[PDB]
Design a binder for this molecule. Structure first.
Ligand SMILES: C[C@@H](N)c1ccc(N2CCOCC2)cc1
Length: 150
């Protein structure tokens, strides 16, 4: 019973979380997942500030109210070569990665690794935080509160 959570640098508190190496998070699971990091889904203003500090990904993820890709450098296979906070407009499907916002993170680029999952609750799952540099932090627990996401 294992969940891998690939996480990024934080930019103005905002970071990206990909579960199990594929788009697999529902909006309800995304809110619960950020809560395990003492975090919330970023507002659009929080994500725009993160972008301005250097944050970009090539993956769709939830923020509060939308699914987006923050882009700095145009790339034909990332948000169709757009820059800025690219907003997904038309999709059939509901599962994406998520972004999270930790208000206690540093104000600008924080590319140290994530070494804790501070607010996970008791549970049976081995949850592994996987950093971009490969360093891992694992803990037994659970973060999902909605049955439909388990
Ligand atoms: C580098 C180390 N002090 C550290 C950095 C970030 C985190 N996380 C906490 C959970 O939410 C995002 C950031 C944990 C520890």
């Amino acid at each position: 019973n294992q969940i891998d959570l690939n996480v990024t640098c934080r930019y103005a508190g905002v970071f990206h979380v990909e579960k199990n190496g594929r788009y697999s998070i529902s909006r309800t699971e995304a809110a619960d997942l950020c809560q395990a990091f003492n975090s919330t889904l970023p507002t659009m203003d929080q994500m725009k500030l993160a972008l301005s500090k250097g944050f970009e990904t090539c993956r769709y993820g939830f923020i509060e109210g939308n699914v987006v890709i923050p882009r700095i450098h145009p790339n034909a296979i990332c948000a169709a070569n757009h820059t800025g906070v690219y907003i997904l407009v038309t999709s059939n499907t509901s599962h994406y990665d998520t972004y999270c916002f930790n208000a206690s993170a540093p104000p600008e680029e924080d590319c140290t690794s994530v070494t804790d999952l501070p607010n996970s609750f008791d549970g049976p799952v081995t949850i592994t935080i996987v950093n971009r540099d490969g360093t891992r932090y694992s803990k037994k627990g659970e973060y999902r509160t909605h049955q439909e996401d388990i």
